[PDB]
Design a protein around this ligand. Structure first.
Ligand SMILES: C[P+](c1ccccc1)(c1ccccc1)c1ccccc1
Lengths: 89, 102, 103, 90
């Protein structure tokens, strides 16, 4: 159910500004966690969290040209499956 | 005055425990913040209404008007039934609140 | 075992409430931290009893033992600040409590 | 027999003053000391901020050099004792 609709708004070769639909007031969670790593897997992935009232987040420090996989998890798996996408910088 | 804030803290906690049942594990941000704000207020409301009314006296009245307002709010617009012998137990708590009141 | 965590959570809240009388509007460190700690314990214990003991009997015991433990603790550390018509009013509040929970 | 006690200026600086005080015994420790600082002349209000009652030190920045300031440390209520106030020229 939440989060819903994960897409990349602005895209710099080394940064991706993403966003999602945080739900709606009474379905706002306390925090989302965002996971970005290389689409391959030669190394681990990078991760951070965002408060539940914010719907956007910036991902900095990427490598240009590389395709990345970005995932946004709810606090728990009870709010629906985590939504994931791909982007080539 | 003292039995006004005690009831305001009773109303505060009852709203706190209900908003907690609505939110999940403090995950739903809005009713989670509602529970934190309610408990903080009721913590500071009970703290200020204890210097006047004795400790054991206010514990009783709370346990009273709490479940009163809990089961009243329960039958109010949530579920219903439960083990309802009658509202005779609700009228008991009211009496003790009165004969301890002003 | 699962019935003990109640009385411990009862007593922990019993201790925290008496410690709140020492916090001075949460303006005195050590009692203020203590009340926050005490209530974190009774929470965690009560949450460990809701998984086994029903909510009705677990709480009816809480109201009774608590209204006895904190009221007796308010006699040694203090005594009475504004006693009024009846002490039995609290026992009959506790009575009406036990008959809208158990009954 | 009041708190706080012994309000002294540890480090100084034209634009900053590091200060400390005697929080008293473990039963005399409060939860928040509110501290006030303004100009000695008194042609202005007085800046104020709080600081956790488990810390006996407080740093103040944004001061104007050469000026003499008056610093006062309060308690949550006036029940703990008269607040302690001092002076210092940066
Ligand atoms: C201190 P109390 C409480 C009050 C207000 C907000 C949140 C909690 C409480 C309320 C009414 C009557 C007796 C005690 C509590 C705390 C931990 C575990 C069980 C109860």
């Amino acid at each position: 159910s939440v989060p819903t609709k994960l897409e990349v708004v602005a895209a710099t070769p080394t940064s991706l500004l993403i966003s999602w639909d945080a739900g709606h007031w009474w379905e706002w969670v306390t925090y989302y966690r965002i996971t970005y790593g290389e689409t391959g897997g030669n190394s681990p992935v990078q991760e951070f969290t965002v408060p539940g009232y914010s719907s956007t987040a910036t991902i900095s420090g990427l490598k240009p040209g590389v395709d990345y996989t970005i995932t946004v998890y709810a606090p728990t798996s009870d709010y629906g499956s985590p939504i994931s996408i791909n982007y080539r910088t | 005055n003292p039995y006004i804030y005690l009831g305001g803290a009773i109303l505060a906690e009852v709203i706190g425990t209900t908003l907690m049942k609505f939110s999940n594990g403090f995950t739903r941000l809005i009713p989670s913040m509602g529970t934190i704000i309610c408990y903080c207020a009721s913590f500071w409301l009970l703290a200020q209404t204890l210097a006047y009314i004795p400790t054991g006296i206010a514990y009783a009245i709370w346990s009273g008007v709490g479940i009163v307002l809990i089961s009243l709010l329960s039958w109010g617009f949530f579920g219903q039934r439960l083990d309802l012998p009658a509202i005779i137990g609700m009228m008991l708590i009211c009496a003790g609140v009165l004969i301890i009141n002003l």
